[PDB]
GROMACS .gro file of C-alpha atoms in nm:
model
  373
    1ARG     CA    1  -1.081  -0.892  -0.183
    2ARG     CA    2  -1.181  -0.686  -0.399
    3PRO     CA    3  -0.885  -0.668  -0.625
    4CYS     CA    4  -0.582  -0.760  -0.423
    5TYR     CA    5  -0.279  -0.558  -0.521
    6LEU     CA    6   0.111  -0.596  -0.490
    7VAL     CA    7   0.354  -0.357  -0.565
    8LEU     CA    8   0.730  -0.372  -0.604
    9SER     CA    9   0.979  -0.142  -0.600
   10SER     CA   10   1.283   0.044  -0.414
   11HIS     CA   11   1.076   0.274  -0.215
   12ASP     CA   12   0.947   0.149   0.076
   13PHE     CA   13   0.566   0.299   0.094
   14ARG     CA   14   0.625   0.393   0.483
   15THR     CA   15   0.894   0.675   0.322
   16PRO     CA   16   0.755   1.067   0.351
   17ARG     CA   17   0.732   1.255   0.088
   18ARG     CA   18   0.536   1.077  -0.169
   19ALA     CA   19   0.676   0.994  -0.539
   20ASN     CA   20   0.448   0.867  -0.818
   21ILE     CA   21   0.485   0.526  -0.702
   22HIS     CA   22   0.317   0.637  -0.379
   23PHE     CA   23   0.036   0.843  -0.531
   24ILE     CA   24  -0.072   0.528  -0.738
   25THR     CA   25  -0.054   0.283  -0.408
   26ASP     CA   26  -0.279   0.497  -0.231
   27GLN     CA   27  -0.543   0.467  -0.528
   28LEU     CA   28  -0.506   0.074  -0.479
   29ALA     CA   29  -0.553   0.112  -0.121
   30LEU     CA   30  -0.880   0.249  -0.194
   31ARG     CA   31  -0.990  -0.072  -0.403
   32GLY     CA   32  -0.873  -0.328  -0.242
   33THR     CA   33  -0.595  -0.501  -0.029
   34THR     CA   34  -0.277  -0.359  -0.097
   35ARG     CA   35   0.110  -0.448  -0.041
   36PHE     CA   36   0.393  -0.284  -0.083
   37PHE     CA   37   0.725  -0.496  -0.094
   38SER     CA   38   1.043  -0.306  -0.096
   39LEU     CA   39   1.369  -0.432  -0.210
   40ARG     CA   40   1.787  -0.324  -0.290
   41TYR     CA   41   1.747  -0.269   0.068
   42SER     CA   42   2.008  -0.456   0.235
   43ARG     CA   43   2.300  -0.391   0.538
   44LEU     CA   44   2.533  -0.284   0.259
   45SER     CA   45   2.248   0.017   0.266
   46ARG     CA   46   2.359   0.126   0.578
   47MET     CA   47   2.729   0.276   0.419
   48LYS     CA   48   2.535   0.364   0.167
   49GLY     CA   49   2.296   0.594   0.319
   50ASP     CA   50   2.015   0.461   0.167
   51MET     CA   51   1.709   0.704   0.246
   52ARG     CA   52   1.493   0.384   0.432
   53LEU     CA   53   1.766   0.353   0.710
   54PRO     CA   54   1.470   0.511   0.984
   55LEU     CA   55   1.269   0.163   0.878
   56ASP     CA   56   1.560  -0.047   0.970
   57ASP     CA   57   1.417  -0.187   1.294
   58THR     CA   58   1.113  -0.297   1.102
   59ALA     CA   59   1.289  -0.476   0.855
   60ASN     CA   60   1.161  -0.812   0.781
   61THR     CA   61   0.787  -0.831   0.908
   62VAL     CA   62   0.463  -0.672   0.811
   63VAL     CA   63   0.398  -0.295   0.921
   64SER     CA   64   0.022  -0.139   0.825
   65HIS     CA   65   0.052   0.215   0.679
   66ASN     CA   66  -0.244   0.416   0.550
   67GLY     CA   67  -0.437   0.114   0.485
   68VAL     CA   68  -0.115  -0.048   0.315
   69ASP     CA   69   0.054  -0.355   0.452
   70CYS     CA   70   0.457  -0.281   0.389
   71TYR     CA   71   0.732  -0.486   0.398
   72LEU     CA   72   1.109  -0.363   0.386
   73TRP     CA   73   1.291  -0.685   0.303
   74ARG     CA   74   1.642  -0.709   0.412
   75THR     CA   75   1.914  -0.952   0.332
   76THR     CA   76   2.269  -0.887   0.394
   77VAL     CA   77   2.372  -0.751   0.113
   78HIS     CA   78   2.170  -0.629  -0.233
   79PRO     CA   79   2.320  -0.657  -0.591
   80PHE     CA   80   2.401  -0.387  -0.797
   81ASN     CA   81   2.569  -0.188  -1.087
   82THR     CA   82   2.899  -0.215  -0.988
   83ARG     CA   83   2.965  -0.014  -1.339
   84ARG     CA   84   3.272  -0.226  -1.416
   85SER     CA   85   3.271  -0.437  -1.698
   86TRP     CA   86   3.510  -0.703  -1.545
   87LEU     CA   87   3.262  -0.724  -1.237
   88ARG     CA   88   2.964  -0.874  -1.460
   89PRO     CA   89   2.989  -1.196  -1.433
   90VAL     CA   90   3.014  -1.160  -1.080
   91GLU     CA   91   2.700  -0.903  -1.039
   92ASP     CA   92   2.506  -1.136  -1.274
   93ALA     CA   93   2.587  -1.406  -1.003
   94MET     CA   94   2.439  -1.190  -0.756
   95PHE     CA   95   2.136  -1.103  -0.959
   96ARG     CA   96   2.047  -1.482  -1.003
   97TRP     CA   97   2.107  -1.525  -0.624
   98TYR     CA   98   1.858  -1.204  -0.569
   99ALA     CA   99   1.618  -1.347  -0.735
  100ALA     CA  100   1.625  -1.731  -0.594
  101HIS     CA  101   1.602  -1.630  -0.243
  102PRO     CA  102   1.281  -1.478  -0.166
  103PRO     CA  103   1.171  -1.471   0.136
  104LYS     CA  104   0.879  -1.621   0.230
  105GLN     CA  105   0.643  -1.347   0.275
  106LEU     CA  106   0.692  -1.217  -0.060
  107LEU     CA  107   0.580  -1.619  -0.203
  108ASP     CA  108   0.263  -1.579  -0.035
  109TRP     CA  109   0.191  -1.176  -0.148
  110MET     CA  110   0.236  -1.269  -0.494
  111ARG     CA  111   0.044  -1.597  -0.442
  112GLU     CA  112  -0.231  -1.363  -0.260
  113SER     CA  113  -0.243  -1.094  -0.551
  114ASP     CA  114  -0.464  -1.019  -0.822
  115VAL     CA  115  -0.273  -0.784  -0.975
  116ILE     CA  116   0.086  -0.725  -0.940
  117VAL     CA  117   0.296  -0.402  -1.010
  118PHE     CA  118   0.682  -0.390  -1.063
  119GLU     CA  119   0.844  -0.071  -1.054
  120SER     CA  120   1.062   0.008  -1.346
  121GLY     CA  121   1.423  -0.079  -1.189
  122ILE     CA  122   1.571  -0.409  -0.903
  123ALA     CA  123   1.141  -0.517  -0.902
  124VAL     CA  124   1.252  -0.664  -1.310
  125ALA     CA  125   1.415  -0.938  -1.176
  126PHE     CA  126   1.118  -1.099  -0.962
  127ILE     CA  127   0.891  -1.097  -1.292
  128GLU     CA  128   0.960  -1.430  -1.369
  129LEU     CA  129   0.898  -1.541  -1.002
  130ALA     CA  130   0.542  -1.421  -0.994
  131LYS     CA  131   0.447  -1.587  -1.312
  132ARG     CA  132   0.547  -1.885  -1.161
  133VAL     CA  133   0.421  -1.810  -0.855
  134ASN     CA  134   0.071  -1.668  -0.959
  135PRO     CA  135   0.004  -1.684  -1.326
  136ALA     CA  136  -0.315  -1.591  -1.308
  137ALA     CA  137  -0.249  -1.236  -1.181
  138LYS     CA  138  -0.222  -0.975  -1.398
  139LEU     CA  139   0.136  -0.828  -1.427
  140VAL     CA  140   0.160  -0.507  -1.449
  141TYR     CA  141   0.515  -0.253  -1.521
  142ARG     CA  142   0.490   0.064  -1.402
  143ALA     CA  143   0.822   0.261  -1.642
  144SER     CA  144   0.831   0.523  -1.399
  145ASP     CA  145   1.213   0.537  -1.547
  146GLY     CA  146   1.430   0.416  -1.832
  147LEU     CA  147   1.595   0.191  -1.707
  148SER     CA  148   1.913   0.259  -1.905
  149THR     CA  149   1.854   0.610  -1.701
  150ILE     CA  150   1.862   0.474  -1.356
  151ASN     CA  151   2.174   0.253  -1.511
  152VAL     CA  152   2.066  -0.040  -1.379
  153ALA     CA  153   2.308  -0.322  -1.405
  154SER     CA  154   2.333  -0.533  -1.743
  155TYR     CA  155   2.134  -0.793  -1.577
  156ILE     CA  156   1.850  -0.617  -1.534
  157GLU     CA  157   1.869  -0.499  -1.915
  158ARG     CA  158   1.849  -0.854  -2.047
  159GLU     CA  159   1.603  -0.968  -1.789
  160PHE     CA  160   1.390  -0.726  -1.863
  161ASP     CA  161   1.405  -0.781  -2.266
  162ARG     CA  162   1.364  -1.134  -2.151
  163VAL     CA  163   1.052  -1.102  -1.982
  164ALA     CA  164   0.879  -0.803  -2.109
  165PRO     CA  165   0.678  -0.944  -2.372
  166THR     CA  166   0.537  -1.178  -2.089
  167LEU     CA  167   0.395  -0.847  -1.905
  168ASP     CA  168  -0.001  -0.786  -1.926
  169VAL     CA  169   0.071  -0.446  -1.923
  170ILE     CA  170   0.358  -0.205  -1.975
  171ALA     CA  171   0.279   0.142  -1.875
  172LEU     CA  172   0.522   0.398  -2.031
  173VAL     CA  173   0.495   0.750  -1.807
  174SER     CA  174   0.662   0.882  -2.124
  175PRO     CA  175   0.616   0.758  -2.486
  176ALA     CA  176   0.946   0.863  -2.535
  177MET     CA  177   1.069   0.543  -2.326
  178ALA     CA  178   0.932   0.281  -2.596
  179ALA     CA  179   1.266   0.307  -2.773
  180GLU     CA  180   1.390   0.127  -2.543
  181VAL     CA  181   1.121  -0.159  -2.423
  182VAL     CA  182   1.159  -0.458  -2.589
  183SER     CA  183   0.804  -0.534  -2.696
  184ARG     CA  184   0.527  -0.369  -2.875
  185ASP     CA  185   0.161  -0.523  -2.842
  186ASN     CA  186   0.131  -0.490  -2.415
  187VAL     CA  187   0.279  -0.098  -2.403
  188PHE     CA  188   0.081   0.233  -2.309
  189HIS     CA  189   0.127   0.547  -2.239
  190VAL     CA  190  -0.012   0.660  -1.934
  191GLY     CA  191   0.183   0.965  -1.764
  192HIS     CA  192   0.155   1.085  -1.387
  193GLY     CA  193  -0.142   1.175  -1.223
  194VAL     CA  194  -0.254   1.438  -1.022
  195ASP     CA  195  -0.455   1.513  -0.695
  196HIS     CA  196  -0.816   1.539  -0.786
  197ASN     CA  197  -0.840   1.831  -0.566
  198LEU     CA  198  -0.470   2.052  -0.643
  199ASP     CA  199  -0.761   2.353  -0.749
  200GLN     CA  200  -0.912   2.315  -0.344
  201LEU     CA  201  -0.565   2.329  -0.207
  202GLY     CA  202  -0.460   2.599  -0.335
  203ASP     CA  203  -0.657   2.877  -0.175
  204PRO     CA  204  -0.484   3.077   0.015
  205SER     CA  205  -0.178   3.238  -0.070
  206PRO     CA  206   0.088   3.235   0.131
  207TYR     CA  207   0.205   3.565  -0.091
  208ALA     CA  208   0.199   3.907   0.033
  209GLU     CA  209   0.238   4.153  -0.287
  210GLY     CA  210   0.497   4.191  -0.508
  211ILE     CA  211   0.671   3.951  -0.798
  212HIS     CA  212   0.659   3.573  -0.656
  213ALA     CA  213   0.868   3.275  -0.806
  214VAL     CA  214   0.893   2.955  -0.652
  215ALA     CA  215   1.056   2.593  -0.668
  216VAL     CA  216   0.995   2.308  -0.533
  217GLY     CA  217   1.175   1.966  -0.489
  218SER     CA  218   1.548   1.872  -0.454
  219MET     CA  219   1.615   1.662  -0.784
  220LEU     CA  220   1.929   1.768  -0.939
  221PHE     CA  221   1.906   2.110  -0.735
  222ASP     CA  222   2.104   2.372  -0.833
  223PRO     CA  223   2.141   2.679  -0.639
  224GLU     CA  224   2.369   2.848  -0.851
  225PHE     CA  225   2.071   2.880  -1.054
  226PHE     CA  226   1.945   3.106  -0.745
  227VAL     CA  227   2.318   3.289  -0.653
  228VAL     CA  228   2.251   3.444  -1.063
  229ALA     CA  229   1.837   3.474  -1.074
  230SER     CA  230   1.801   3.644  -0.697
  231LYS     CA  231   2.070   3.913  -0.840
  232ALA     CA  232   1.907   3.967  -1.176
  233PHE     CA  233   1.584   4.055  -1.049
  234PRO     CA  234   1.587   4.187  -0.718
  235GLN     CA  235   1.211   4.255  -0.711
  236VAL     CA  236   1.167   3.895  -0.795
  237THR     CA  237   1.089   3.660  -0.432
  238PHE     CA  238   1.232   3.350  -0.465
  239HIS     CA  239   1.055   3.089  -0.276
  240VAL     CA  240   1.304   2.761  -0.218
  241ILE     CA  241   1.090   2.464  -0.082
  242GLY     CA  242   1.285   2.095  -0.032
  243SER     CA  243   1.540   2.226  -0.234
  244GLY     CA  244   1.720   1.923  -0.024
  245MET     CA  245   1.985   2.206   0.143
  246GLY     CA  246   1.986   2.554   0.288
  247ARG     CA  247   2.057   2.851   0.209
  248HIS     CA  248   2.374   2.871   0.000
  249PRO     CA  249   2.586   3.209   0.106
  250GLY     CA  250   2.535   3.306  -0.270
  251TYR     CA  251   2.153   3.355  -0.250
  252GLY     CA  252   2.006   3.735  -0.244
  253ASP     CA  253   1.782   3.854   0.010
  254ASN     CA  254   1.519   3.784  -0.176
  255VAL     CA  255   1.551   3.410  -0.189
  256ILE     CA  256   1.335   3.256   0.118
  257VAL     CA  257   1.452   2.914   0.173
  258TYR     CA  258   1.189   2.662   0.342
  259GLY     CA  259   1.279   2.317   0.461
  260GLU     CA  260   1.059   1.998   0.291
  261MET     CA  261   0.708   2.078   0.291
  262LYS     CA  262   0.428   1.796   0.254
  263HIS     CA  263   0.312   1.792  -0.085
  264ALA     CA  264  -0.020   1.987   0.006
  265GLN     CA  265   0.128   2.286   0.166
  266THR     CA  266   0.311   2.318  -0.161
  267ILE     CA  267   0.002   2.417  -0.354
  268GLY     CA  268  -0.088   2.713  -0.254
  269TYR     CA  269   0.302   2.821  -0.320
  270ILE     CA  270   0.246   2.702  -0.636
  271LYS     CA  271  -0.079   2.810  -0.757
  272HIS     CA  272  -0.025   3.189  -0.651
  273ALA     CA  273   0.348   3.238  -0.806
  274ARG     CA  274   0.430   3.451  -1.123
  275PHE     CA  275   0.640   3.166  -1.243
  276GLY     CA  276   0.779   2.854  -1.132
  277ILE     CA  277   1.176   2.693  -1.219
  278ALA     CA  278   1.322   2.375  -1.203
  279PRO     CA  279   1.648   2.398  -1.151
  280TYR     CA  280   1.828   2.082  -1.260
  281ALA     CA  281   2.188   2.135  -1.221
  282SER     CA  282   2.221   1.881  -1.535
  283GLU     CA  283   2.130   1.887  -1.902
  284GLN     CA  284   2.236   1.513  -1.866
  285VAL     CA  285   1.890   1.388  -1.832
  286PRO     CA  286   1.671   1.189  -2.020
  287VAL     CA  287   1.431   1.317  -2.321
  288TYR     CA  288   1.135   1.186  -2.124
  289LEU     CA  289   1.230   1.402  -1.820
  290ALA     CA  290   1.017   1.671  -1.989
  291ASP     CA  291   0.696   1.471  -1.964
  292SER     CA  292   0.836   1.250  -1.598
  293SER     CA  293   0.893   1.586  -1.386
  294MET     CA  294   0.649   1.533  -1.130
  295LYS     CA  295   0.729   1.947  -1.017
  296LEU     CA  296   0.651   2.046  -1.400
  297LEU     CA  297   0.363   1.887  -1.388
  298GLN     CA  298   0.202   2.007  -1.120
  299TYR     CA  299   0.289   2.411  -1.243
  300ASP     CA  300   0.164   2.277  -1.621
  301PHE     CA  301  -0.121   2.182  -1.402
  302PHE     CA  302  -0.205   2.561  -1.272
  303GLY     CA  303  -0.049   2.682  -1.634
  304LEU     CA  304   0.248   2.838  -1.418
  305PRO     CA  305   0.513   2.954  -1.696
  306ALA     CA  306   0.833   2.781  -1.589
  307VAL     CA  307   1.182   2.837  -1.663
  308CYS     CA  308   1.399   2.471  -1.703
  309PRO     CA  309   1.729   2.353  -1.883
  310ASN     CA  310   1.692   2.348  -2.231
  311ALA     CA  311   1.683   1.963  -2.240
  312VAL     CA  312   1.351   1.968  -1.992
  313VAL     CA  313   1.105   2.222  -2.233
  314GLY     CA  314   1.080   1.905  -2.459
  315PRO     CA  315   0.693   1.931  -2.606
  316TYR     CA  316   0.569   2.218  -2.377
  317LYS     CA  317   0.459   2.539  -2.416
  318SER     CA  318   0.484   2.789  -2.113
  319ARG     CA  319   0.875   2.703  -2.051
  320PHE     CA  320   1.172   2.895  -2.133
  321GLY     CA  321   1.486   2.730  -2.156
  322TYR     CA  322   1.802   2.807  -2.028
  323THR     CA  323   2.132   2.651  -2.006
  324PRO     CA  324   2.268   2.526  -1.602
  325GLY     CA  325   2.581   2.777  -1.569
  326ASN     CA  326   2.547   3.013  -1.862
  327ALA     CA  327   2.403   3.336  -1.630
  328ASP     CA  328   2.336   3.510  -1.917
  329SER     CA  329   2.093   3.241  -2.041
  330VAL     CA  330   1.905   3.220  -1.659
  331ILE     CA  331   1.843   3.554  -1.727
  332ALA     CA  332   1.682   3.536  -2.055
  333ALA     CA  333   1.454   3.285  -1.987
  334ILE     CA  334   1.338   3.490  -1.651
  335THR     CA  335   1.279   3.707  -1.871
  336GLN     CA  336   1.026   3.555  -2.100
  337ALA     CA  337   0.848   3.367  -1.777
  338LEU     CA  338   0.757   3.720  -1.659
  339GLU     CA  339   0.544   3.818  -1.948
  340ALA     CA  340   0.415   3.463  -2.006
  341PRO     CA  341   0.051   3.446  -2.003
  342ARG     CA  342  -0.091   3.164  -1.761
  343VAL     CA  343  -0.255   2.902  -2.010
  344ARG     CA  344  -0.417   2.524  -1.911
  345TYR     CA  345  -0.262   2.396  -2.208
  346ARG     CA  346  -0.182   2.056  -2.053
  347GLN     CA  347  -0.467   1.746  -1.987
  348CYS     CA  348  -0.348   1.603  -1.638
  349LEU     CA  349  -0.582   1.314  -1.517
  350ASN     CA  350  -0.638   1.265  -1.165
  351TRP     CA  351  -0.483   0.984  -0.967
  352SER     CA  352  -0.798   0.768  -1.008
  353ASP     CA  353  -0.831   0.790  -1.397
  354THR     CA  354  -0.476   0.763  -1.422
  355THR     CA  355  -0.433   0.480  -1.227
  356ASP     CA  356  -0.784   0.353  -1.381
  357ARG     CA  357  -0.520   0.306  -1.708
  358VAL     CA  358  -0.215   0.185  -1.574
  359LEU     CA  359  -0.447  -0.106  -1.459
  360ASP     CA  360  -0.662  -0.162  -1.772
  361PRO     CA  361  -0.498   0.049  -2.034
  362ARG     CA  362  -0.678  -0.155  -2.339
  363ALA     CA  363  -0.975  -0.048  -2.174
  364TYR     CA  364  -0.839   0.259  -2.259
  365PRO     CA  365  -0.721   0.235  -2.634
  366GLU     CA  366  -0.631   0.610  -2.668
  367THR     CA  367  -0.256   0.461  -2.444
  368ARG     CA  368  -0.179   0.244  -2.697
  369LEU     CA  369   0.186   0.329  -2.833
  370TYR     CA  370   0.115   0.038  -3.121
  371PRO     CA  371  -0.146  -0.044  -3.387
  372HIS     CA  372  -0.479  -0.100  -3.191
  373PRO     CA  373  -0.648  -0.488  -3.240
   0.00000   0.00000   0.00000
């Protein structure tokens, strides 16, 4: 049915506020029958506060959502990194057990698929199974994150090293991820895409007169940034969108705090801002985050100058680094961003062109991270 796709991920396709894997899956759904099988969910997830808990009454059944067949697999317990070295044989046993007991629905979908996409993380544990069920299927690993950054259990790191050479495609969001990938000939660089109609979404402006700065998203969200920034720049209005928290009592009156916004509504706040902010509270982040940050990519699409921690400035112009918790550095970076010109320095492929490269990177030899054949 055109090519049939299966995506394996710890996301569920139905969870509001899409991550990169959702945007890719939207493109898959345009190309053929597309399935999204959600992993690492269990009765144990209830005690931990999993974002998929609203979908619990649909567990272990197929639900159609936006043209995609979705399945939230719920087991009694799921394997995880206990972060105790003495518990490693228990972990390994739990992971082996998990991988050894796939539901019939997963097996059927694997068999039916022409292409199986595994997102970095728990999906690693099912790569060998996929090869056994459907050796004809193209196996594509989408490295949204490095395994060590997401801190997967030892079992997952070892299994990925073991199976990585067997994958048809290892599609890294950033070349900085390649150092920890134990393979070469099948390793490619395919960054995140952007919406093909980003420029149509930006107009009209949500802002009136004056200087407006924007932050979108809740990742490592640092309210202390805005406590300092709002006081130091009373002439700037700070638009804090989808931060995952409310109005911190230290925010100046020049901070406007918004609830979660759908992707398309955020664009006007981004395009029409003077500068953007990625207020990550910690610099204990991978080198690849400069490339993989979805919010920084959106700013970059418009050439929006950005203020962000030093650790995520990376190989980019128009990003002004500060040290989280250091007020003077915050102030200095904003000062620089206010005077930075807007220039579209970064080339941003749309999601369709991005998906083309994730699926068939060998057709786009510029994606190769190792010597071309």
